Design a protein around this nucleic acid. Structure first.
Lengths: 50, 797, 558
RNA sequence: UUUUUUUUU
């Protein structure tokens, strides 16, 4: 799916742009700066009307 | 078929048909195919209240009216057996049947409606061949055919047969493919809700009202008009609503006057006060009758969140990628933040945090979203204040705090001001004239006080005259917009309602947002402030208390009652619970914690702290402030037409009130809560009439419904089950949430009244009965001479 | 009762309703309610009694309120609930139908669960009463410390204020509270012990019970009787306990001790009459069955059955002499209704106790106590004018006197004469002679009858001669000075409060002397401080001095 | 076989 592709690309680039860590629960956790942000891709689609 | 025949089954017998006064139709009294008689069915479905008997019937062509006062609402009247034999006197339920009079004993007074059916002597039952000859009709067709009398008055069973479109609205989804699907799924429900709220409010035109004129402190004319108690109680009006007060007649030409409400009917006055906006046309202060008030419906509540959905579905820079892909519910690897943790979580000169709230504060500063679930009395307010203050100190940015309730926003703003941060309160334009405890934090107050130069002269001219020139008005709006922008840019935190985030004045995108008691609001109401460019959203709320009241019934069925907090928890988010309570006695605490909280909740207060010494109240077990006083009365119908009330529970509650008063408890420590509104009303006038001691000492007691008493606490609270019917039907109390929100209101002592037999069928009330009985609290009889009640509570398998 | 009557009827309805078979929670809450209000009433009664000053008249002190409250609590709530329990086990255990025993087993399991719950509740009620009265008030001066530790009151920390420390002496009858707390503790121990014995009956599936199962109840009844000796109702309960386990001589001693107390127990009289007057009573047939079972075992058994011969053959002699009509055959008055000859049975006793006195002396001592109480309960039996001199005695009581003095002279000649010197540790050997002489001196008419009896007089003279000749102590001699002790012996306690010694053994003139010096209450119950605990040898010499003095005083006018 | 409350340019 196009949404799935956007999700995978966003996750991969988030993995690339951050530093790796291990949390208290054991889930792999990425530490990233507050001042740097990523906006997810939108695409196009049809919009419902009143 | 004769005109006298029933409109539902067509029975021609005049000993069973009865004429409705409002719609001029005849109705039978049988229960064929329905749980109730048809006449009351039509009365409640069409709001009708007045009925007239057949001329040929045993009583004759008469209209059922009250003897003493003359009311015509059939739901009130009832027969009283006069002391003289074979004499029947018509009296309404109140105050005629309760004001003692020597000409008849009122203790045998019975409602004209029993078991949802009129009395046989007033209207006899049809004979069996007459029943078999009448056409059968199920309640489904009853409601369907009733639905179209409001449009055409000639509809019959074969007339309509209408396949009106009833499009199956798509049920809400958990994980949407994109923002477009989310918007498409949500839209229709919101359209229906807006349309029907507008429909209901616009139908409340108040006509031929007697208006009394007066001058307020700000030189604004006050239009104070009195209304009937039934209409005023049915009026769902808040302080600050806007309507049109227009008069049309010979005495004075057509006029239109708009303004807000600054006072509402209460226990002291039943006067609606209308502060009129200053207008070029002066109000006719010489007029007192003939005025008509029409409420100005406003779709701004819905259009704003429509704009919010537009922003979510269109703008890329509306929401950060992580919170976007979490709101859509898509799988995303967990993300942390590079923020230095504070040395000590607790703040000096303020509340000291325990381990649980320390965990809550610690785990919240590192993640972009999390959910905090707070049992009542724990004090979520201090946790929210600490989180806001520490995040603001960490990032030094503008912070947004929102909550569906205006009083809750006021409380959080006062608390945040107690921390020394800079707090600005965004008051609604209609609410700008409404006083509050944080009125000094009002943004309008801020611009008015911090006005300088031309701005003072413009504000003074606007206040003195009321209206300005077009050029002056444009300078004024531009300059106040400039000042507001400076204030907001200078302000550390911004206070606005969850619906106030749709205002255009909040043009600036906000990054740090606190949403408080999110469950109390629906999902769009919490999505309003989240699409304004935020990267860290923190949601506070508890999903075991009352949430959103959705008037639309298809919307509530489809899922509009499911708040964002509930959806996120259902997604897989595990909240952080605070496991200590500081309000109610451990005996008062053992049940709700065990049933709703899995027993994990712990008591932060001791038994002695929640124990009043030398208490002379006859509790069944000394040391256990909880009892179940069983009453075997029968429930009735109030003047509304859909509520219920019980007189036996009213007298018993008044007795308990007096008994607690002789124990020394002040009225401010005792309140009464009733799950039904008409019961609350009856309790109110019964207390104000039959007060054994001074009536003032009773009127100071606050009485309100369960839903209107959410988020508050009292030393003593009395619970009334009311429901007492032969069919053992309880109604809307089947949800455990309503029971949960009710018990925790009381700090020291809890008193429960009602009929244990009706409640015994419900499993939840069955376990409440088990817990009350096993602790030696299930009693019966007079409070002075309480013995245990031995009704069989366990159903024999 | 004007306030407690409804709950008595309320409890009655619940048993009749049979709702407790399904809903035990009803019973539990009902019990909580009654426990709450009875505790409140007890507390109000005690606080009302405490508020009165010492100057108030003794007649204005209502001592019986709490006693009535607690008797109502047992006999009207606890005992009826136990009775319902008992009928319930009776129904399920004795269900004559052919239903599977597994269902009865699960019902039995439900019995144990619920009755452990109920007994735990009742024991909590009583123990809470005890602990509360120990907490708000000081009881050290009035109760022995042994009762305090045996009730585990020592671990209960005392929260009484210094100003709340009541200054009441050991035996100041002016202070009302010197009696209500003793009665309260005595009846609490009474009802706790009844709870334990009843629970023991409950837990055992079969109807066969052994002495080893009622140990705790026996202990609690022991402290109960120690708390208040002047309550024959305590002794009757222990008598029943020994009744159902088949120990009968100790049982009859218990019932007699119960009825001739200062306050007589009607149930003890009824029980004794059932064993002794009502021939139709099943307990009398139990006695008859076991007595000729003992005869069969003596005749055919491989060994001489010493213990139960000594006990039940003695019971047979006591019957045949005390109530001649119901046991001796109308055709043959010389044999029991079971056909057992009286002379053979009596000689069997003589040989048996002369041979095995040392292993069963306690049973013989109980035989002595029953024998001496028999004459008093016989002259109490008189519906005519009570006897005052020997002339008014009828033939039956003269025969009883002859047999009793025969027994006394025999065993004084055969047991004390040979075993006093060899066995200093056996205090009963000399305490028995002390009892014999104290009883002969407390009643003038037996004393006058004794001087006419050659056997008893010569036996006493022989015993005096042997004691003098053996010369137990160098300074031992016949002196008129009454020996004094610092406490009371075991015979004083076990014969305390009984009228045939005028409720106290007066062979020592030290009661006031014991009272004036410390630990008097503890020393009165034979538990002095370890410093004053003399050796059993010194005890035997003091008993010897008292015995020889009183015996010489008796034989001066023989 | 359901009647209660929140919000509002």
């Amino acid at each position: 799916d196009k949404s799935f592709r956007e999700s995978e690309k966003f996750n991969n680039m988030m993995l690339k742009n951050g530093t790796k860590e291990e949390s208290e629960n054991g889930r792999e956790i990425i530490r990233t700066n507050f001042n740097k942000t990523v906006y997810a891709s939108r695409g196009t689609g049809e919009l419902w009307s009143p | 078929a004769s005109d006298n025949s029933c409109a539902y089954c067509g029975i021609d017998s005049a000993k069973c048909v009865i004429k409705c006064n409002s719609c001029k139709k005849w109705f039978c009294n049988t229960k064929n195919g329905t749980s109730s008689s048809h006449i009351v069915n039509h009365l409640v479905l069409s709001h009708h209240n007045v009925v007239s008997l057949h001329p040929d019937s045993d009583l004759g062509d008469t209209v059922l009216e009250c003897y003493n006062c003359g009311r015509k609402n059939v739901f009130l009247l009832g027969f009283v057996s006069a002391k003289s034999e074979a004499v029947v006197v018509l009296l309404c339920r109140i105050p005629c049947a309760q004001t003692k009079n020597a000409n008849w004993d009122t203790d045998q007074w019975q409602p004209l409606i029993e078991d949802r059916q009129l009395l046989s002597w007033v209207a006899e039952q049809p004979t069996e061949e007459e029943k078999l000859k009448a056409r059968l009709i199920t309640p489904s067709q009853i409601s369907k055919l009733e639905a179209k009398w409001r449009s055409n008055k000639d509809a019959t069973i074969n007339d309509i047969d209408a396949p009106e479109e009833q499009e199956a609205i798509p049920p809400l989804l958990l994980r949407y493919q994109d923002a477009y699907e989310y918007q498409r799924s949500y839209g229709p429900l919101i359209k229906l809700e807006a349309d029907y709220d507008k429909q209901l409010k616009e139908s409340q035109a108040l006509e031929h009202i007697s208006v009394s004129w007066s001058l307020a402190l700000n030189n604004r004319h006050l239009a104070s008009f009195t209304l009937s108690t039934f209409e005023s109680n049915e009026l769902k009006v808040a302080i600050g609503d806007e309507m049109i007060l227009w008069y049309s007649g010979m005495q004075h030409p057509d006029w239109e006057g708009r303004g807000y409400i600054v006072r509402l009917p209460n226990s002291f006055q039943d006067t609606f006060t209308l502060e009129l906006k200053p207008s070029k046309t002066p109000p006719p202060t010489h007029l007192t009758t003939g005025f008509t008030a029409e409420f100005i419906w406003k779709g701004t509540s819905y259009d704003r969140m429509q704009d919010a959905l537009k922003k979510f579905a269109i703008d890329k820079k509306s929401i950060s990628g992580y919170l976007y892909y979490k709101i859509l519910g898509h799988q995303v690897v967990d993300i942390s933040f590079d923020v230095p943790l504070p040395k000590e979580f607790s703040i000096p000169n303020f509340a000291q945090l325990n381990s649980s709230q320390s965990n809550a504060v610690s785990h919240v500063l590192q993640r972009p979203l999390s959910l905090i679930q707070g049992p009542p009395g724990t004090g979520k307010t201090v946790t929210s204040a600490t989180i806001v203050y520490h995040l603001s100190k960490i990032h030094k940015d503008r912070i947004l705090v929102c909550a569906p309730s205006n009083v809750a926003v006021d409380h959080l703003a006062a608390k945040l001001r107690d921390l020394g941060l800079k707090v600005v309160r965004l008051t609604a334009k209609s609410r700008e004239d409404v006083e509050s405890s944080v009125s000094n934090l009002a943004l309008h107050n801020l611009v008015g006080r911090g006005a300088k130069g031309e701005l003072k002269n413009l504000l003074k001219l606007k206040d003195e005259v009321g209206e300005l020139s077009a050029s002056d008005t444009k300078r004024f709006v531009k300059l106040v917009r400039k000042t507001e922008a400076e204030i907001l840019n200078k302000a550390d935190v911004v206070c606005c309602t969850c619906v106030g985030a749709g205002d255009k004045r909040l043009d600036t995108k906000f990054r740090t947002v606190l949403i408080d008691e999110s469950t109390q609001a629906s999902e769009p109401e919490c999505l309003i402030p989240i699409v304004k460019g935020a990267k860290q959203v923190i949601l506070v709320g508890d999903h075991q208390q009352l949430g959103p009241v959705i008037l639309e019934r298809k919307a509530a069925d489809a899922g509009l009652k499911q708040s964002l907090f509930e959806r996120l928890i259902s997604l897989g988010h595990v909240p952080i619970r605070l496991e200590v309570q500081y309000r109610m006695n451990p005996y008062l605490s053992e049940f709700p914690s065990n049933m709703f909280y899995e027993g994990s909740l712990q008591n932060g207060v001791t038994i002695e702290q929640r124990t009043v010494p030398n208490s002379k109240f006859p509790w069944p077990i000394r040391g256990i402030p909880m009892m179940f006083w069983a009453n075997y009365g029968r429930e009735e119908i109030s003047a509304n037409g859909t509520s219920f009330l019980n007189r036996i529970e009213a007298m018993n509650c008044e007795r308990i009130i007096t008994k607690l008063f002789r124990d020394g408890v002040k009225p401010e420590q005792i309140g009464v809560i009733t799950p039904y509104e008409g019961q609350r009303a009856y309790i109110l006038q019964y207390m104000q009439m039959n007060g054994s001691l001074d009536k003032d000492l009773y009127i100071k007691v606050e009485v309100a419904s369960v839903d209107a008493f959410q988020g508050r606490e009292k030393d003593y609270i009395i619970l009334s089950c009311v429901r007492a019917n032969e069919q053992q039907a309880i109604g809307f109390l089947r949800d455990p949430r309503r029971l949960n929100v009710g018990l925790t209101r009381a700090k020291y002592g809890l008193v429960i009244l009602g009929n244990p037999r009706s409640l015994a069928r419900n499993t939840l009330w069955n376990h409440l009965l088990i817990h009350f009985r096993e602790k030696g609290c299930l009693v019966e009889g007079t409070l002075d001479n309480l013995q245990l009640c031995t009704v069989q509570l366990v159903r024999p398998q | 009762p004007t306030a407690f009557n409804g709950i008595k009827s309320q409890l009655n309805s619940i048993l009749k309703s049979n709702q407790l078979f399904q809903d035990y929670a009803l019973l539990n809450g009902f019990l909580a309610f009654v426990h709450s209000k009875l505790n409140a009433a007890i507390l109000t009664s005690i606080e009302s009694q405490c508020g009165k000053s010492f100057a108030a008249d003794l007649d204005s002190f209502d001592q019986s309120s709490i006693s009535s409250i607690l008797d109502f609590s047992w006999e009207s709530v606890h005992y009826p609930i136990f009775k319902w329990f008992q009928m319930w086990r009776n129904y399920i255990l004795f269900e004559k139908e052919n239903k599977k025993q597994q269902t009865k087993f699960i019902d039995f399991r439900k019995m144990n669960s619920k009755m452990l719950k109920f007994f735990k509740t009742v024991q909590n009620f009583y123990v809470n009463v005890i602990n509360t009265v120990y907490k708000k008030y000081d009881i050290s001066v009035l109760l022995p410390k042994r009762i305090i530790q045996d009730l585990k009151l020592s671990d209960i920390e005392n929260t009484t204020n210094v100003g709340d420390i009541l200054a009441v002496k050991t035996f100041n009858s002016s202070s009302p509270l010197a009696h209500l707390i003793p009665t309260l503790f005595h009846r609490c121990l009474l009802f706790l012990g009844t709870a334990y014995r009843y629970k023991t009956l409950l837990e055992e599936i079969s109807n066969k019970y052994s002495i080893s199962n009622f140990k705790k109840s026996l202990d609690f009844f022991r402290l109960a009787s120690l708390v208040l000796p002047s309550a024959g109702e305590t002794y009757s309960q222990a008598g029943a306990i020994f009744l159902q386990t088949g120990n009968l001589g100790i049982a009859v001693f218990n019932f007699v001790k119960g009825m001739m107390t200062k306050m007589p127990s009607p149930v003890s009289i009824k029980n004794f009459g059932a064993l002794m007057v009502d021939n139709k009573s099943s307990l009398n047939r139990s006695l008859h069955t076991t007595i000729m079972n003992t005869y069969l075992q003596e005749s055919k058994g491989p060994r001489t059955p010493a213990k139960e011969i000594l006990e039940f053959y003695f019971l047979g002699l006591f019957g045949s002499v005390w109530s001649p009509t119901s046991w001796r055959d109308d055709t043959k008055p010389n044999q029991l209704n079971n056909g057992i000859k009286l002379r053979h049975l009596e000689n069997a006793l003589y040989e048996t106790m002369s041979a095995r006195y040392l292993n069963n002396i306690k049973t013989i001592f109980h035989n002595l106590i029953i024998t001496i109480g028999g004459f008093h309960l016989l002259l109490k039996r008189r519906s005519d004018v009570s006897a005052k001199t020997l002339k008014d005695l009828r033939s039956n009581e003269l025969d009883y006197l002859n047999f009793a003095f025969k027994y006394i002279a025999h065993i004084l000649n055969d047991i004390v004469k040979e075993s006093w010197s060899e066995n200093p540790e056996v205090s009963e050997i000399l305490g028995m002679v002390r009892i014999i002489n104290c009883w002969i001196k407390a009643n003038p008419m037996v004393l006058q009858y004794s001087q006419s009896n050659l056997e008893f007089v010569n036996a006493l003279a022989y015993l005096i001669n042997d004691i003098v000749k053996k010369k137990p102590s160098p300074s031992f001699s016949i002196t008129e000075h009454i020996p004094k002790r610092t406490y009371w012996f075991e015979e004083d306690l076990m014969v305390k409060g009984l009228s045939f010694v005028n409720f106290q053994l007066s062979d020592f003139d030290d009661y006031e002397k014991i009272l004036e010096m410390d630990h008097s209450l503890d020393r009165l119950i034979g538990n002095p401080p370890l410093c004053d605990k003399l050796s059993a040898s010194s005890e035997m010499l003091l008993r010897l001095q008292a015995v020889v003095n009183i015996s010489s005083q008796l034989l001066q006018n023989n």
